[PDB]
Structure formats: C-alpha cells, structure tokens
Design a protein around this nucleic acid. Structure first.
Ligand SMILES: [K+]
Ligand SMILES: [K+]
Ligand SMILES: [K+]
Ligand SMILES: [K+]
Ligand SMILES: [K+]
Ligand SMILES: [K+]
Ligand SMILES: [Mg+2]
Ligand SMILES: [Mg+2]
Ligand SMILES: [Mg+2]
Ligand SMILES: [Mg+2]
Ligand SMILES: [Mg+2]
Ligand SMILES: [Mg+2]
Ligand SMILES: [Mg+2]
Ligand SMILES: [Mg+2]
Ligand SMILES: [Mg+2]
Ligand SMILES: [Mg+2]
Ligand SMILES: [Mg+2]
Ligand SMILES: [Mg+2]
Ligand SMILES: [Mg+2]
Ligand SMILES: [Mg+2]
Ligand SMILES: [Mg+2]
Ligand SMILES: [Mg+2]
Ligand SMILES: [Mg+2]
Ligand SMILES: [Mg+2]
Ligand SMILES: [Mg+2]
Ligand SMILES: [Mg+2]
Ligand SMILES: [Mg+2]
Ligand SMILES: [Mg+2]
Ligand SMILES: [Mg+2]
Ligand SMILES: [Mg+2]
Ligand SMILES: [Mg+2]
Ligand SMILES: [Mg+2]
Ligand code: NA
Ligand code: NA
Ligand code: NA
Ligand code: NA
Lengths: 125, 159, 203, 103, 50, 52, 119
RNA sequence: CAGACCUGAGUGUGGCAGGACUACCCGCCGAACUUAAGCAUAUUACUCAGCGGAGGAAAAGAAAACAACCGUGAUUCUCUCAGUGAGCGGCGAGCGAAGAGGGAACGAACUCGUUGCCGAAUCGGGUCUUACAAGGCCUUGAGUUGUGGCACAAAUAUCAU
RNA sequence: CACGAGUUGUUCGGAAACUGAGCACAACGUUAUAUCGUUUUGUUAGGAAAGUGAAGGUGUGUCGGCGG
RNA sequence: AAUUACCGAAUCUUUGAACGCAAACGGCGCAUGGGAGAAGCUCGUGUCAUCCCCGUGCAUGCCAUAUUCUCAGUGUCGAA
C-alpha cells in the first residue's frame, strides 16, 4: 500500500523521518519509470498514496522544526532576533496598531479625576 | 563641501553688514581672566548629578523611615541656577546676584533680551564666550545662562 | 517666564535687529535644500505652542515654497470654452502655501505623521515653514497619552486631506455659524445636503 | 492656424546640430597661473578639418603644469600655423603669429 | 525564425500542450456538458503573436 | 571694449576666402549643410498656406 | 588644519563595522539526499532513444528544465552509480528539458537501462 | 597639543514609507455639450474627466455660537423653516440658504502651550521581580535651547501623617 | 484530421563582456499633484557618491649571500 | 487511511510596490553559511584546487539608536 501513518511519523525521530523520505522519494521515481514504460494499473495506482505519504513525512518534519524553533526564540533575551517568518502574522495594520496597554494610557490628572468621580450605579423609584 | 562654504560665508556676512546694538552687545564679551574666575565659581557650585541627588534622597528616605515623626528637609545643597526658565524667574524675582550669559546661543532670540532684563532689574551680568564652557562648568553639553543666587561665606569675597 | 520675552520679540519682526537676524537666516536658507532636517526648531516657543516637544520621536523640518501666483498649466496659455475660463496668470491657488509646504513634507517622508507647521522666514523668491513631524513607531510617542492618538491609522497623511491647522484655514473652518454655514462640515457635504432630491415614502 | 516653422525649430527635435564626426569645441587653454605670470610653450602636432567649420583646427600639445602628463588642447588655427610650430601662451609670450597673449 | 526568448518559447510550448481534443471519457461523466474543445487553435486561423 | 587681461591670438583665422567661390549646384549646398544642421532647402513663406 | 593636494573635497574613509549574519529566515526542512530525484525525472523510451542506448552508450532522460549539465552528471552518479562523460541537453518544443547522457566505456548503457527498468 | 560644543557625514543595529482598493468620505484641480428659443455675464456646475489621502465610516465637534426672547447652549442627522412678500440674477433664463420649533443620538467630554508654584521628580536603554510591568536597581545615552508634576470658573491650595 | 515522434555545441548566434544615434535610475530642481525637467560640447548632483591601493613598519612561508 | 463540511498546525514555483545589478537575457554580482566534488594530495578512507549547486544579507529615503562606533569643517571655543 505504501501508506505511512501520521501517528508513527509523529513518534519517529528526525533522522528516521529523513531516511523514510528518501525511500519514498526513490520508490516514487521508480514508479515514474513505470509510467513511461506502460506498466500495470495496480502499480500505477500506488503513485497517489506514495505522493501523499511524502507530503505527510514533510509535514511532520516542518511542523516539528517550526515548533522547536519557536521554543528556542521564546527566550526573552533572544526574542528580539526572532525571524519574521516565525512571528505572528495577523495583519499589517494590526501589527502597527496601538496595543491595549498603550491605548489605555492616562495622564496623572486623568487618573486622579477618574478615581475622584467614578461612574455610579443608580435607579429612580 | 557646501556646509563648510556656507558656515564660513555666514561669518563674513555677519561682519560686513551693519549690526544693531541688540545683537552687537554679544560680541563684547567679558575678559578672559574674569571669565575663568566666574566659571570656576560656577563649577564650584555646580548642580548635583543624578547619582548624588539619588543617594541624598535615599538617605532622607531612610531617616524618614527610621523616625517617621521627625521631619527631614529635602532641600538640595546650595547650587547655581541653570536652565532658561529657572534663570529667568530668578532675574524677575530678583534672587540672582550675578547672571552669566553665553554669547553664541543659536537661535539668539533665546537670550537676546536677557542683558536688558538684567539691566532693568539692576542684576549684575556678564556675557561669555561659550555655552559649551558654561555647560562644562555645570556638567552639561551646553548652557545658555547660569545665575548665582547665594554662595558660602568663603566664596562671598570672590563673588 | 522666558516665553513672554521670546513671544513679544517675535511680534517685532520689522524692527532693526529682527530684520538683521531674518536677513542672515534668509540668505542661509536660500543656499540649502527644499527640505532640510533640523535638530531643534528655529522658533522653539512657536513649535511648542503648536505641539512640538523636546522628546524622542518629535522631528522638525524646514520646507521651502516658491512665492507668487499660480499660473494655469495650459499649452502656450491657450484656453478653450467660454471666456470666463480664459485667465492664465491672474488666478490663485485655493490652498495656502503653508498647506503646500506640509503636503510636500508629508508626501516625501511617508513614515512620519505631520502634526503642525509655522512661518519662520521669507524673501522675494521663497517662503519657509518649519513642519513638526512625529514618528508613530517610536516607543516614547506610542506610550505618551498626549500624542499617541496620531499613531492610529485614521490620521495617516492628515495633511494630504487638509486636516492640519493650515488645511482648516483654507477650507474655511476658522469661522462658525452664519459665516460658514455653507462650508460645514465641508462644502461638498453641504452641497450634498442642499442638492440631493429627497423622496419621502409617503408624500 | 498652426505653428510656424521658425517657432517649431525652437523645440530642437530634428533641427539640432549634427554634432557627430565633430572633434569637439575649439578653445584656448585654461587661463591658469602659468599664463597669468609666465608662459607655456606648446607644439602644433596636427592641423585638422571639422565638418561644419570652414576654419582649420590645430591640435597643440602642452605639458601639464602640475602633473607628469600632456594636455593636447584643440584651438582654431590661425592662417600660417604649421605642424611642429612652437606656440607660446602667457603673459611673457613674444608677439608672433600663433602665440596667445593678454590684450 | 531561430531567435526567441526562452519565455516566449515556454508560452508557445504551453499553447501547443493546450491544443488538444477533449478526451472521450469526459463526455461519459454524469453531468457532462463538454463535447469538443471550444478553444482549439490552428496556426493559419488565429495568430498568437508572441 | 574688453578687459586688458582677456587673451587673444596673433593673426587671422585660417581658411579665408571660402565664400568667394560660387556653389553652382543644389547638391553642393546639400553637402555643405550635412555637417551643420537641418535647415536646407528653404521654402518661401508666400509658397506656404496661410494656416502655417 | 590638514593639507589637501587635490582641488576638490572627497569623503574621507571612516571605520565601517561589518554586518552580522542574521538567523536563518527560511526554516523549512530540506533533504540533501533527495535532490537528485528532482534533477532526473524519468527516462525516454522512443525509437531514437532506444537506438542511442545500444550504438552510442547513451541514455535519454527528461530532466529538470532549470538543471545544469554539471548537476545532471552529479545526479547520474548519485542515482545510478555510473560516470557520465558527456551530457547534451535541449529544451523540447513542449517545454521539457531532455538530456542525452553518454556513459563511460567502463559502464554498459544497456545494462544500466535494464536495472533502471526501461529495458 | 589634545579636548569640548555646534554643524554635517560614513557604517552597524532596531523599525517605517512604497502598491492595491477607492461605492461612500476628505483635499486639490476642473470642462464642455446643454439652457437662455441667438449669445459673451449667467446656466449646466463650485458637477464630469484629472491628481493626491483615509476609515468602517469619513468629515465635523466642546462656542471669538445663536439670538434680541420669560432667552437658547459642542458636533452630525431628520421633519420643517422654504422654491421662501429672505436674498442673488443681461433682476433675464434661472438660482437660493440661516436662526427658531417637533425629533434622532448623547453617562460627552478632554489634551497641550501660556501664567503661577516646582525643577529631571521625565524619556529611552540595560537588568531583576513568573513581567520589552504605568514596578525596583542602574545608565550619561537623550534632555535644562525644558521632559515631567500641581492649580485655573464643573474651580476655590499642596503636603504630609 | 487523428496518433506517435523530432530541434544534442568548450569553439556556431546571443549573453557573460565594447562603445554609437540615443534612453533616463540616482541626484537636484519644478509642479496643487512627478505620471515634469536636466542627465556625452568629458560626462550626474552646492557636489563629502573612490572601500582601490604605490612605497613603507609587523608576522608566516619560498629563496640567493656571509659567518659560526 | 472512506467521504464531505469547517478550521487553529503546515507547504506555498516564476513574477509583480519588487527592493543586490539587469532584462524580448529563466542572465550577472559583493559578502557570509553550506552542498557535491572520478584532478591533485594523505592513509577504496579522508581531504580537496578550478568548475558547479543551494540558503541568508545587500534598493532608496526617513525615524530611532550606538556597552556610548569612526570621522569632516580658515563654524565657535579651549588648550599647545
Ligand atoms: K487664454
Ligand atoms: K492579436
Ligand atoms: K523529444
Ligand atoms: K479604503
Ligand atoms: K434651439
Ligand atoms: K493625468
Ligand atoms: Mg535646572
Ligand atoms: Mg543637439
Ligand atoms: Mg526567418
Ligand atoms: Mg495568415
Ligand atoms: Mg514572434
Ligand atoms: Mg526657396
Ligand atoms: Mg500651394
Ligand atoms: Mg544547446
Ligand atoms: Mg498609496
Ligand atoms: Mg445633457
Ligand atoms: Mg442656445
Ligand atoms: Mg449656437
Ligand atoms: Mg471625478
Ligand atoms: Mg455609524
Ligand atoms: Mg473622525
Ligand atoms: Mg447646538
Ligand atoms: Mg409654505
Ligand atoms: Mg449654482
Ligand atoms: Mg443649528
Ligand atoms: Mg510643560
Ligand atoms: Mg493539424
Ligand atoms: Mg549617446
Ligand atoms: Mg545636453
Ligand atoms: Mg555639475
Ligand atoms: Mg530586482
Ligand atoms: Mg540586449
Ligand atoms: Na474652459
Ligand atoms: Na444644518
Ligand atoms: Na502531437
Ligand atoms: Na576646527
């Protein structure tokens, strides 16, 4: 079937994943030869599972690498050098927009006035 | 370079044209010996630095914590008055005993009026060669004007 | 304080000393670029009055604008249509030179936000304005409650929309009431209000 | 109406100088210190014709007054200039055909 | 002629690849509406002009 | 009148007498103006239309 | 003041700290042992290709259209353990790159074709 | 000599601007056909086309405002004022608003400069606290050519304890 | 029309890598607005656009010559 | 390990504001990390010149910044 399970991929190490990737890349190339020289449809039907297995192997490797690198750059001393490809995307405007902390800043007089005359809860009978 | 040519040509144009007395008075500076004596007195009474002010306040805070009932004066040691706003208030309210004005302030409108203000209030004043030297005496890069409002008994004769 | 003496001194531009000072400065400005960055404002009292502060993130630029009336840019001064539109030299720009100087500075440096500007000097050929600019990405600006409003994206290129003090001047917003009823909230908005055909459902 | 031909020529376009094959502008040498006080002696190396000019041009080789090299100026040759002629240019140059002197 | 940019050659290559008839099994699909390729091109009828 | 420090070259410009020879041909004028500019031949103003 | 022996001022050369190498901005996992599979796609089995196999010791492949002759030689060594002495390439009118790869006399093209599976 | 300041450069480090969209909105620029039974002022029109610039709305907005009343009270919008016994106009063709009144909305008000009293108490940058804390410690780096604090009519100290 | 094929380069043409009539990025200036102008008559820009390096001083290696 | 629907984790060729320099050229650089290397060398193992492949940085302008970086000025001083 040449179907590799995602559960086993997530348990394999980096070197094992690279080894499996090479095997599936090799076997895919052998099937490309079969595609040229006719071949039985049963062999040709293996191309799609193998291509998707290669995608699964690459998905695991890239997901693991990105997660590990985000952990490494989560250090406070090193988070100013975080690659932009690993920073949060959001939106151009939202990255440049004032955060809540900066937008809520008040002057000392404003702070005192808010404390001196807070908004009250009331009712009329 | 263009900026080099312009700064030399600016000096030429300032000397060739007719300079009104308000601007011309800043070219008639105090003599070197008196200027050095004045800046020495200013350096002696220079304002305290960030560090020295900080330990003084911390010592006051510790004394306040040690004896909460007692009152500790936060007054800084006697020093010169620096900064355009504070010097101007000292001249207006007549606390300044002597005022020292730099002659190369640019824009000159900042201190162009000060000699007349000192004259109107009968405050002794002098015009000296460098705001940089004035800043050096007070521990800054530059200083437009510096006013002395009081000195210790040993420096009273010098003042 | 010291502001008064500086403020009253600048009300005497025609005096001998102020004329000498402005002459030397006008000569120096003639030999500089159209747009020039300054470390400090030439008129600190005027700049501070208009919103400048001696803080990280505030910038001051001097902008040169050419004096005189606007010439209509038609080929060989040839106009068509009715003779009412045949003028070439005698028409005037509906914007003031201060707004033009602000728009010149703002368009050239898109990373800054234009706050205000003020007159500094002029000669027979040129008029000079100093424009106060604010960095919206500066930490000091962003955390200062007094200027951080300009960080918001609604204020991007406000000088290009005539929202500065000079822009308000030529729009007519200095006046209120019966002096500017047809100009408020804008002349186009007033035109929309007065010219749209209203169709009530039950008429 | 339409633009007159004399006005159209002011635009440049196809009415400009046919400057290709011209040798360059013809001029005296630069009025430098040597000319103002002494003289500079050169040698006429070639007499050449330039398209669009009736007068002959002379290539005159001078030594560089400040550097170890040659200058090779190009002037309008007066009548009688010949290859190998010595050209004197300066305050102290003698009065002779081909020499350049202050008026 | 002989000369053409590789980009022009690649565009001409794709137009060659597109100039093919509809496969027969397409017409047998459940909701098929395609019978013949409506964008067939002949070098003598319409010019690509690359 | 010119300043006396302005220089001059002793003699007359070479190639004098050029304008003394009749051209005799439109073709010779064609070659004459080849090296100068596009200004020949010349059409009289009266031969043109009033629009131009 | 200094002395200037040239009639115009030029910018003096000052100290220039060199830029530091930044952390990599491409964080994908790329395997070196699978690069040759992209370089060499599949062989051809046309009558012309078959003819060259037995007479010219040459194999015919469809290769990456951006690939090098040098890289195709390296890929042939990595994928089939044979030495290519000459690679000729052409971009087909269909847009794909085709390579004629002549093996050294030590290697038999027919035997290599048998192992490949094109036969 | 050095060195300082001022002015101006080079490089490193950390960021931003660039284009698209453009119905609505903001700033400029800006016609003519048309109508006047012709036509130039006028009208079409402070419109179309053209160039800039934003947002989910924009703009406007806390009185150098109306009114002339027994007074109203930031802005925007709706009815109405009103196709007007306002006015503008070859007073021709045509054009043409504003206050008040009934309403929508509305917890709607705030900041600076100045003045007086203070005078680095401020800002960045390191570093620690679970923290690029509205925090502590440090820092000449910025800043006295002035950052920041307190009070100014909705007011009648601040400054401790 | 349908299907299957064909175009092989160290030296051929182009490019790498020349200048020409010319173009116009930067720079500066202008314009309400750059989508404007200048930009080879040796030649950008009020104009600080050279990061290249001769002789030398300092270490390594390859050598010729003297003495021990 | 069906298939659909949805979405948080990913991939995302050449390009285009397009921005290392160019361009009817799938072209050519300066640094800095790699990769492959059948010549040469060392004991087929290592290493590897020229050639070749790949990643990252490098447009311009502006702002801020410099463990307080390197400089220019017959600008103003101050010391030799
Ligand atoms: K006209
Ligand atoms: K066509
Ligand atoms: K083929
Ligand atoms: K928009
Ligand atoms: K009619
Ligand atoms: K246009
Ligand atoms: Mg002070
Ligand atoms: Mg010409
Ligand atoms: Mg042909
Ligand atoms: Mg045909
Ligand atoms: Mg063609
Ligand atoms: Mg004629
Ligand atoms: Mg005729
Ligand atoms: Mg080929
Ligand atoms: Mg835009
Ligand atoms: Mg119509
Ligand atoms: Mg009519
Ligand atoms: Mg008519
Ligand atoms: Mg429009
Ligand atoms: Mg709404
Ligand atoms: Mg708004
Ligand atoms: Mg109201
Ligand atoms: Mg009615
Ligand atoms: Mg109207
Ligand atoms: Mg109203
Ligand atoms: Mg203040
Ligand atoms: Mg056919
Ligand atoms: Mg040319
Ligand atoms: Mg020219
Ligand atoms: Mg020049
Ligand atoms: Mg590019
Ligand atoms: Mg070409
Ligand atoms: Na018109
Ligand atoms: Na209204
Ligand atoms: Na075919
Ligand atoms: Na100096």
């Amino acid at each position: 079937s040449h179907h590799m399970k995602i559960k086993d991929l997530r348990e394999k190490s980096k070197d094992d994943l690279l080894k499996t990737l090479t095997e599936y890349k090799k076997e895919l190339s052998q099937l490309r030869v079969v595609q040229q020289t006719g071949g039985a449809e049963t062999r040709l039907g293996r191309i799609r599972p193998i291509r998707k297995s290669i995608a699964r192997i690459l998905t695991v490797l890239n997901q693991n690498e990105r997660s590990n690198l985000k952990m490494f750059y989560a250090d406070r001393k090193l988070r100013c050098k975080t690659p932009k490809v690993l920073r949060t995307k959001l939106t151009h405007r939202r990255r440049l927009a004032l955060k809540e902390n900066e937008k809520n800043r008040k002057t000392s007089r404003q702070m005192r006035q808010a404390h001196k005359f807070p908004k009250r809860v009331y009712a009329v009978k | 370079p263009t900026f080099v040519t312009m700064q030399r040509k600016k000096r030429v144009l300032q000397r060739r044209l007719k300079v009104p007395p308000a601007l011309n008075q800043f070219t008639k500076v105090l003599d070197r010996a008196s200027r050095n004596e004045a800046l020495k007195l200013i350096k002696k009474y220079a304002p305290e630095t960030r560090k020295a002010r900080r330990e003084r306040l911390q010592k006051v805070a510790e004394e306040k914590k040690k004896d909460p009932k007692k009152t500790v004066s936060t007054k800084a040691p006697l020093a010169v008055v620096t900064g355009l706003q504070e010097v101007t208030r000292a001249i207006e309210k007549k606390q300044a005993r002597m005022v020292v004005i730099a002659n190369n302030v640019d824009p000159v409108e900042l201190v162009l009026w000060m000699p007349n203000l000192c004259r109107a209030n009968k405050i002794p004043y002098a015009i000296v060669k460098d705001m940089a030297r004035l800043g050096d005496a007070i521990g800054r890069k530059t200083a437009t004007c510096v006013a002395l409002t009081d000195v210790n008994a040993e420096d009273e004769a010098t003042l | 304080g010291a502001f008064m003496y500086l403020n009253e001194l600048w009300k005497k531009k025609s005096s001998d000393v102020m004329r000498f000072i402005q002459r030397i400065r006008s000569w120096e400005f003639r030999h500089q670029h159209t747009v020039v960055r300054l470390r400090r404002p030439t008129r600190p009292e005027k700049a501070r009055m208009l919103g400048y502060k001696t803080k990280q993130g505030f910038c001051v630029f001097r902008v040169r604008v050419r004096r005189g009336g606007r010439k209509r840019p038609v080929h060989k001064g040839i106009t068509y249509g009715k003779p009412k539109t045949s003028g070439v030299l005698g028409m005037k720009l509906n914007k003031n030179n201060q707004a033009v100087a602000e728009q010149r500075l703002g368009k050239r440096f898109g990373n800054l936000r234009v706050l205000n500007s003020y007159w500094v000097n002029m000669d027979s050929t040129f008029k000079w304005y100093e424009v106060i600019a604010v960095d919206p990405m500066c930490k000091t600006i962003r955390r200062d409650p007094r200027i951080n409003w300009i960080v918001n994206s609604v204020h991007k290129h406000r000088e290009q929309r005539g929202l500065t003090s000079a822009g308000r001047k030529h729009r007519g917003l200095r006046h209120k009431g019966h002096k500017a009823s047809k100009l408020r909230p804008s002349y186009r908005a007033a035109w929309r209000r007065n010219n749209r055909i209203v169709f009530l459902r039950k008429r | 109406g339409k633009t007159v031909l004399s006005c159209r020529k002011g635009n440049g376009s196809v009415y400009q100088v046919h400057g290709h094959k011209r040798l360059g502008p013809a001029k005296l040498r630069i009025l430098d210190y040597a000319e103002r006080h002494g003289y500079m002696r050169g040698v006429v190396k070639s007499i050449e014709h330039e398209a669009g000019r009736g007068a002959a041009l002379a290539r005159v080789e001078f030594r560089h007054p400040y550097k170890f090299r040659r200058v090779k100026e190009l002037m309008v040759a007066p009548e009688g200039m010949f290859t190998g002629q010595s050209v004197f240019c300066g305050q102290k140059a003698p009065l002779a055909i081909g020499n350049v002197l202050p008026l | 002629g002989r000369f053409k940019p590789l980009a022009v050659k690649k565009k001409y290559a794709k137009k060659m690849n597109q100039n093919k008839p509809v496969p027969y099994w397409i017409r047998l699909r459940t909701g098929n509406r395609i019978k013949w390729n409506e964008k067939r091109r002949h070098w003598r009828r319409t010019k690509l002009n690359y | 009148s010119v300043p006396s420090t302005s220089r001059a070259m002793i003699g007359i410009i070479s190639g004098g007498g050029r304008i003394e020879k009749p051209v005799l041909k439109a073709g010779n004028s064609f070659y004459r103006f080849r090296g100068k500019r596009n200004c020949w031949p010349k059409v009289r103003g009266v031969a043109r239309n009033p629009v131009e | 003041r200094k002395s200037y022996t040239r009639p115009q001022f030029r910018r003096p050369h000052t100290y220039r700290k060199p830029a530091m190498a930044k952390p990599s901005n491409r964080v994908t996992v790329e395997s070196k042992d699978i690069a040759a599979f992209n370089v060499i796609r599949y062989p051809l089995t046309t009558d012309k290709a078959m003819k060259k196999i037995e007479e010219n010791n040459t194999l015919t492949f469809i290769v990456d259209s951006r690939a090098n002759k040098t890289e195709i030689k390296k890929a042939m060594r990595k994928l089939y353990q044979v030495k290519a002495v000459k690679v000729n390439t052409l971009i087909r009118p269909d847009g794909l790159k085709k390579a004629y790869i002549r093996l050294s006399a030590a290697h038999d093209a027919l035997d290599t074709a048998n192992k490949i599976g094109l036969v």
